[model samples]
Target chain A: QDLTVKMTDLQTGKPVGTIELSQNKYGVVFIPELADLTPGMHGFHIHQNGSCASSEKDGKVVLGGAAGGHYDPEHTNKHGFPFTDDNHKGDLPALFVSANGLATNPVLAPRLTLKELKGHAIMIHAGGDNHSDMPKALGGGGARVACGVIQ
Target chain B: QDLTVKMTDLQTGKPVGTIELSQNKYGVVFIPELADLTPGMHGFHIHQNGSCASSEKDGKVVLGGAAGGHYDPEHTNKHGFPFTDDNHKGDLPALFVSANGLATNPVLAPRLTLKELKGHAIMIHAGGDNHSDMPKALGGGGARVACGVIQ
Candidate 1:
């Protein structure tokens, strides 16, 4: 089944954009309208588990490590890059946000399946993703700016 | 400080309502609109770490678990429920959606602070929250239907 997602930026309190997702037996295709995104290349991938239970460090909200690790059913070691075959399930290709702060491209992920997507979550990062874990795994995509779960 | 939030339905892809969050020195207050929610009680709370990354799972589009877990500085066990003070810091009060599918109420959380909300996420579950680990850890809210990161 295909899914249409509409999300808002909690910071600016505005509509982030709409995503058109079509799924088949093999994998899924995501067509995102990054018209509202800042100009840059962002890291995007699928997380291992779906648990957004809020966790606070001190009195402030802790960033990263909140959504748990990437989606790795095999519980394999975390890969150093998105292109690697041994990286976290959350590691994917880079999403390029155009200069107008919008990304109009169709991202393809061949590893996904409809069975796994039936019950999972989708998220958007604040910073750019290098597609490598050189400094940090998953391109060190900053804080979770926006999020939505799949139905 | 006052926090204004707009809620949207992930299934229908529309704006459900808005919420007004006010913060004094002690805690935070959430006042929601009832006209834009499903008629019934829904699980409402702030996520730990903020980041809504767009990742795919299986063959469907999903919202990644951007928010971490309940904020607990005391290293409290992940048990008990709200009003018991044994839950996570991100655990607030449950939202009561009226028959019209809208939630209009004033909620208070003494453990959550205003500064922490900058990089956090706020989410609305598809089902209701029981505030107990029995039925489900986090109210068995079903799936991560709609979510947003706090600016």
Candidate 2:
């Protein structure tokens, strides 16, 4: 399976990153070259919609807020680790960006495949994601920075 | 039951209107006072989000685009008239804007309940809506002129 997604900054609607999924008999590799971020770690996940619209909550901008919260098709409100099966289906890993605000790393979402990830928007948050629930809801991962529609 | 939402312009993000949803034993009533639309008929519907943010569609700008189409939980893409249950769940009455681009009519969503309308966005389109499948896909509402979330 293979998939290509172009990520963009929410505010300016400019292309900033690209995510690739190329797989074979062995396994699938999810690679990303997300640039123009905060030059550090940022929270990443799949949103429920196929939109990258900037949305608002309490009259404040939340970047890709239009994509709608984490992709939890089920009514499960639990926020778990990226690799956990019982967590939000949209939960992924923290995107590590270089000092130049670019991330060119490879990660794995064990149960995430092209089929399920398709038609969903991948979101980038301004803060780091701890993949935990105690500190704040959904890792307390601050605001959304960018988003992309997965195809 | 009651819920309130603030409306904002899709492109400018400026405050445009307010929506008040109040339920009685009979049904739910949607009251609006939007002020940023054209002085005429506008397509109005309940969208599938609690946001009024900018969203992307086909790499283009569609304000409040993240609301994700009409709230068609029934999966019926057929377009129907207002107060009818045969089309998308988000289907509602066509809002009438006075000469000053302000709408102050209260319409009843016979088939929609307070719960379903909650956590969704109310969108107003630029053009008029026939609400029939013959007219257009999504009533040919054109652009989202203004939108607000149903809290």
Candidate 3:
């Protein structure tokens, strides 16, 4: 199964990128283009819900609170690469956005498939992550900068 | 092994609380004492980094930005109670602060151990959480309130 999803920012509800999830020779291919990411690194993960609506908090309308956190079916409650057998099912590799606000490379989710990601959402974080709870926690990826429904 | 870590506000770097983590007969025992939190509920979790500094977002510095997001080794970004198997490794029950800013509860992380949390940091958010993102994404826990480096 192969599918392409539209990515949008919860703050703006504006389209910012396109990611193509396809089942191919490499397992699951994530081909992205024109993502509105800040230069440097961004935490990338699959969320638990399908909605990308607005969620209010402390009088400030927070973005993408409806999508929930990363998708973890096995509920390992861990953070690791998609290739790791015991890692969070939603933990994907980092998406490196260039100075031009774009990520044109194709990353692979070796353990995932298009059919498995239905009713999910792709979330791009506001910060970068070292993939470890070191210098910072949760890979230091801040808020949900952008997201898209997977259906 | 038992360890008590001192918590401090990321903004002012002032002492706010203390968390004692240990292993007991039932599960991992975590006792909190002397918490000066706002009345009601606040977000609680483990962070990835041990650094307690500020980070930049959109040209502004975010307190505790250096610590990163919730501690999620499995990368399960979902927020929930410790008994639940489907949540971030850092996910714990909401910390209830009384009218006097006192949050004294013994929360448990059945899935975690003292050895597992070494070099990690515990974080407290500024708002309440329903343990789901139905209304707010990521349990609607806002801003970094207090954080501590787990030594």
lDDT tens digits by residue: candidate 3, A53-133: 867788987688888777888887677655556757787767756556777645555567688899998988898655555
lDDT by residue for model 2 (A1-151), tens: 6788898887778899699976532233467877777765578788889888766679877667778878887657877655456678787756666656777655545445577777889888888676767687788777887888988
TM for every model, in the order presented, reads 0.44, 0.48, 0.48
Query: How high is the lDDT of residue A92 in model 2?
Result: 71
The better-scoring model by lDDT among 1 and 2 is 2
Better of 2 and 3 by lDDT: 3
* Residue-level lDDT tens digits of model 1 in B1-151: 7777655555566666677777754357667774655554456767666754444668776653545565556676564334345676666656655444555545555556677777676777766665666668776766665565667
* Tens digits of per-residue lDDT for model 1, A50-82: 544445767987433355556777566664333
Q: Can you tell me the CAPRI class of model 1?
A: incorrect
DockQ head-to-head 1 vs 3, winner: 3
List residue ranges in candidate 2 displaced over 4 A. A1-151
Name the top lDDT candidate: 3
Every model's DockQ: 0.01, 0.01, 0.02
**Docking quality tier of candidate 2?**
incorrect
Question: Alpha-carbon error at B30 in model 1, in Å?
Answer: 0.6
